[PDB]
Amino acid sequence: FKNDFNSFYYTSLLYLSTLEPSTSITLAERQQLAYDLSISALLGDKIYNFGELLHHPIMETIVNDSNYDWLFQLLNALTVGDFDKFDSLIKVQISKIPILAQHESFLRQKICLMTLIETVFVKNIRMLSFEDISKATHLPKDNVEHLVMRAISLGLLKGSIDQVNELVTISWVQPR
Structure with missing residues (x-):
């Protein structure tokens, strides 16, 4: 609340920057952070690159587990403008997820x-x-x-x- 997604994303990355290598974060909390960063980018006022996010080591925690493979492949399809891959995922993941359905036209x-x-x-x-x-x-x-x-x-x-x-x-x- 009283924020934007690009700002939340940036604060979320900055939190990794401020932490010591002896992170309080876990693999499970990294999976949620990877997810939240990606949903924030999918709705981001200022994300246009996406390629750095798509390869940030934070994401290893979901791709190696297929945890959020649908979200990852959606942000991949945005990263390359692959309308057919984007459409094939949109056809399922928008309908199942209320935030994305509210933002269908933003996606x-x-x-x-x-x-x-x-x-x-x-x-x-x-x-x-x-x-x-x-x-x-x-x-x-x-x-x-x-x-x-x-x-x-x-x-x-x-x-x-x-x-x-x-x-x-x-x-x-x-x-x-």
């Missing part, structure tokens, strides 16, 4: 935000069209403007939508 938007931002970064594209973005997000061209506008609200990039032309121009973006 499906975060993959879309991230897929575009990665594309713009790695392919070094600086002008795009609503068509290409719609292929990369599965939103219709008539709605995709609002998704990419929200990325600028999140402060991830410096760009301008050119919706009258069905276009976008980016000029800076956070590294993937």
